[PDB]
Write an enzyme that holds these catalytic residues in place. Structure first.
Site, mmCIF file in Angstrom:
data_model
loop_
_atom_site.group_PDB
_atom_site.id
_atom_site.type_symbol
_atom_site.label_atom_id
_atom_site.label_comp_id
_atom_site.label_asym_id
_atom_site.label_seq_id
_atom_site.Cartn_x
_atom_site.Cartn_y
_atom_site.Cartn_z
ATOM 1 N N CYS A 1 121.451 45.290 21.301
ATOM 2 C CA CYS A 1 120.153 45.099 21.855
ATOM 3 C C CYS A 1 119.466 46.423 21.891
ATOM 4 O O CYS A 1 118.287 46.441 22.229
ATOM 5 C CB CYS A 1 120.260 44.609 23.328
ATOM 6 S SG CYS A 1 121.137 43.030 23.494
ATOM 7 N N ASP B 1 120.024 49.134 23.807
ATOM 8 C CA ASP B 1 119.741 49.587 25.150
ATOM 9 C C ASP B 1 120.948 50.419 25.531
ATOM 10 O O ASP B 1 122.083 50.019 25.280
ATOM 11 C CB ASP B 1 119.414 48.453 26.135
ATOM 12 C CG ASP B 1 120.602 47.649 26.664
ATOM 13 O OD1 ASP B 1 121.341 47.071 25.830
ATOM 14 O OD2 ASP B 1 120.824 47.656 27.902
ATOM 15 N N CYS C 1 122.596 41.637 28.148
ATOM 16 C CA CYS C 1 122.659 43.005 27.677
ATOM 17 C C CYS C 1 121.549 43.781 28.366
ATOM 18 O O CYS C 1 121.362 44.959 28.116
ATOM 19 C CB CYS C 1 122.485 43.232 26.151
ATOM 20 S SG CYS C 1 120.913 42.627 25.437
#
Lengths: 121, 142, 142, 142, 121, 121, 121, 142, 121, 142, 121, 142
Positions: L46, L48, L116
């Site tokens: 994702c 991140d 996530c």
């Protein structure tokens, strides 16, 4: 055709069709179950040591895998189970045979497979 | 229940199959070429046979018609008649679970014994089971 | 447990799984060519792939045949073999309820929280769910 | 409780029913001819009719789309709207689970009984039963 | 008029009404079975000469032909019907009315047959 | 690492592959029910100003439209829901999820719906 | 058409003929009481923040005007309306409804009034 | 349980109403100018309209006389007769809450949880209510 | 082949020839007795007017001539009959079926004969 | 258990039947001139007919030393050899209520009842009963 | 990811990101000890000839692996594991998995050593 | 849950990181140059990453300061911000036993089923465990 009657009797030539599972009583199932267990246990591979039936208590000393005793659970949520990796499951009747309501499937088949699978290797 | 008369009446004299065929007996006869489908449950050392043919409306689950053959005792014909009548115009459930005990009680009094000429119960079961299988539900049959 | 034997033995000879690829290596291999639908599963992380193609008598509900493909660990070859034997010629319910724990029982004993070296169970669930879709039953399926 | 708004405003003049038909009045009007073929409910002497039209992915039973007709009240349109929004993208059981109180909970002010003002429960029940028949799973209907 | 639903408030037709029959509760089920059994029996006193429910234990005097009791099983698959051939059986819901799972059908229908066959013959 | 399957996996690919909904036991259901309530609570303006959890009882109340209380009854048709409008109805396990043996309804999902019906107006 | 008279009856003119308020079973009163509470709940600014029933004890909140507890009282003096600054007004059945024998009051109706008294002022 | 017989027999010719009115059919019949008041209930669905006319001495609570008009249903007529005989010369009580089961009982075996076939009880409850009102007292009515 | 023993293992062309009864658990003896009792119960049009069957209590109305009681009585000398017109008698197994340890023999024949005699006259 | 060996092999070529008779096959042969009396059992399961005989001194004993003649499986020869060993040196008691366990463990593996290899257990029950009949006590037979 | 906390707790991977072991709450612990036992003694069928699981205890029949008694210990140091050459030790939680109260170290490791030394030689 | 606002706001527009980074984009950038060796967590699927860096007074066991990096969601900034505010000027104990529940309350309110979105829990845990190892207490940690 007669003796001891009435669902029991057949002339043994009407059996070109599937016969009824039968009840009379809930105990019938327990009896059938006990018999199945005895059959499986015998022809020992030395992983199943015994089948026992005391006095209203049924203990099933199962092979070294899938341990759990089978006793009939006190009113509702019938029959004890307690798998070592998959945890408890419980069974209620669905066609004259106890069927898990976590995964479906007959209780009769589970017992068949799991004992003979140990006997192999 | 009371005598229709069950057997030995009237101008056949036992049953209505005997009247129908033509040829009689003749022991050269065959049922050919197609069969009537559904469930067959004929016992050939008990001398009796029943074959029930259902027709079923799929949409409602209602038995449109059900007809029977009865071979054996002529007592059995009356019971077969009454169930086939009853079941028609009624629920799917009506056509299933058919007894057995009911046949025995209805004819006169129940001996609490299955004659072996009272095959109508097994016949109907075979037919509805076959039907359920072919429409693709054999997993809730059993 | 005991040996399968599938230790790259006997007269396999680098593997039977290796023989089934065909074409080796080739770095451009893909799934080909016919398919039955049913279950196909594969995780490259576990390095295993299995594809079970069930055939089921539609009317009876009984598994006519089930054959397998095994890619992965040598231990899995034996798992696929014994499970398909039991399931063939036997109830739908028998076909179901195959898990990693049953496969571990057949082999030795399971590692920490299952071996995850077999995707046999996932394939069986996919195949069963596909049969349910084929016959069109939705409530028991959910 | 909050506005739809659909308090017969405006230029329709009464409800969205007037706006849709066309030709107005005319007293010779008819609705024809193709339709999806789903549940129907209507209660004359309450002045309301509802027709829910499901479209269904037949493989496992997912509501692909569901559009509705509301006749009766402008306030009623919002209750129908909100349920149909929810129901899409979800399994057949989700389609159902409709009360009774639910219809008049969306409307605001639930007595805990119906009058005939809200037909929505009967419309959805009608549609799902009809669906089960066509899908050939009569066991879950009977 | 908005209560009590669906017969004590009607849109002036019986068509397209809701009704969740065989619920609310043990009383409703007992009443329903009695309504089927009695309605069919009538215009014959030899078909069922008596019905009495003294505890939920139902005695059906019939000297004429076969008869059986309908008792209410204690909690865990409540209600029972024993039919002499079928034997005793316990019924659990499968359509919102008590269903023998072994038979795969409602209890109402079993009673239906046994009364209506008797008035005939 | 190979812990803890079923659940957590180390290929991270079981999140697109079929596996049974539950396998132990009543626990799965409880988690899903609780999870649904916690999610629901956010986005309540005045429709629900309180959710109350009681040891062994659970209330999810809407006072701005009214709703029935939910309870678990002694074993025998477990998690028996008394809703006034439809009278009492029963919920049983079918296959890894509670689907009613009536016409098919899930209790977690009924609460979901009724709450967001309230959030709407 | 079919069933349950008394319970449901359709001559299609009983909606303009008087019929007794209740005849069966006695759980009818409970259903009716519940109807009153659910109906009142809509259009409250905060006159009911919850309805919490503790094991068939029923509270109907009016907390900006003082709450009260409405509950069954053990046999003799059984079933009553309890409200502050009016003490017991004790209710008994008189003809198919619980009507006080001292002024002809009805307790269901007392809650309707007293709650809408709050909504008003 | 025995026949009266008053089910479309004899010389009426079909049912009871035919005999009373006279001229038959005539499809323009109306009861005018006076009416006999008190309780009326009637189903066009079941085809039977009952109208009980009580006379009651208000002071001592004794049924002076009671006549009845029953339109349709042979079975009811005999039951209605037997009760009107009984009540007169005795208290309100015996007339009050008459069933339902009682009308059925007279003909043969009651369903014991009836249908809308016997609307007689509702008429009787209305009649008791009417008696309370003409005396003037609605305290016991509630 | 195998299961559920003993008569269901054989082809049943040896059904006529002697084979062990092999009751399991022996609860089965009571079910057999019950089937026999049902067989006594009807096959006549005015005898045995009602069979009452209830949880652990069995009453059997037997026509004018007398009555007998068929119930088990406390451990040892099980299935005792108290006749007031042929005295009390005791029964215990002696060869796979109950046999009177006194004047009589098999219970099954004592019941058969007396019931059939009543139907005649 | 393990192979004796005796698996209808060899030089006989199949077991006892081939070697003993002479005439082979011939399919015109029967038991002649006399017969060996006592118990008899036929079966379609093994397709052959066992016929035992016993000659044993009787004082407190009965005749029960069953030679256990088998024309079935080759494995079955071992079952007769061990049965005749066991029964002798033991009382009538031991030979009654025939195992089951013993025929099974001997033939292949012990599980419950003897499968269908022979119906010999029924024949042994016939024999013990036959002697009791012949010594004229049917009252201890029942 | 939309699975399954606390059952599956990964944002994508957790095989390199630190996270609590997690347990809930008397079922999970029993499953874990059984799982470790099976892992440790794998690749031999003669190591442990039989295992039986009966309520409140666990036996593993072992003829060469010493004696390990698994049993419940009354509240206070719940679940006691017996080491055959240093006696029984009682264990209480201190890191989310049972920690020995004699060295301050987990039971998982205890099982590691004693089981694996035996399968080896 | 309410807007800070910092979700795609303000003047940055997504995150304070873009408004000061440099190099933009450039897709060849990495974390550089000094590091304190504290907790790092990241799910690159994702995209991140989160890095909470504590500074710790050794003598008193108090967190002197804690600053954050937030990459990904703009919502995630609020989790990082508020937690670090609290934990500053307070004991190491505050920074331990961080849930899950804390995340739900702060703003995010997820089922708790990870997506996530937040990695804050993992981040703080890494940091404090690293601190304990350096501190040289391994018993407390294990």
């Amino acid at each position: 055709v007669e003796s001891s009657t009435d669902g029991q009797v057949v002339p043994q030539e009407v059996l070109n069709l599937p016969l009824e599972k039968a009840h009379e009583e809930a105990d019938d199932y327990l009896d059938h179950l006990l018999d199945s267990l005895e059959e499986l246990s015998e022809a020992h591979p030395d992983c199943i040591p015994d089948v026992e039936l005391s006095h209203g208590v049924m203990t099933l000393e199962i092979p070294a895998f899938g341990t759990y005793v089978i006793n009939k659970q006190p009113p509702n949520k019938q029959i004890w189970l307690a798998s070592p990796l998959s945890g408890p499951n419980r069974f209620d009747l669905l066609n004259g045979e106890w069927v898990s309501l976590r995964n479906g499937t007959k209780l009769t088949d589970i017992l068949t497979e799991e004992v003979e699978k140990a006997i192999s290797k | 229940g009371s005598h229709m008369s069950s057997i030995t009446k009237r101008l056949y004299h036992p049953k209505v199959i005997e009247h129908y065929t033509h040829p009689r007996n003749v022991g050269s006869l065959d049922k050919k070429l197609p069969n009537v489908g559904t469930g067959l449950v004929g016992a050939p050392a008990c001398g009796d046979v029943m074959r029930l043919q259902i027709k079923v409306n799929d949409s409602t689950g209602v038995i449109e018609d059900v007809k029977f053959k009865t071979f054996g005792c002529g007592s059995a014909i009356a019971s077969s008649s009454y169930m086939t009548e009853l079941v028609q115009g009624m629920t799917l459930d009506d056509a299933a679970k058919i007894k057995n005990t009911e046949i025995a009680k209805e004819l006169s009094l129940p001996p609490v014994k299955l004659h072996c000429s009272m095959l109508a119960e097994d016949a109907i079961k075979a037919a509805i089971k076959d039907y359920k299988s072919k429409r693709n539900t054999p997993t809730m049959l059993s």
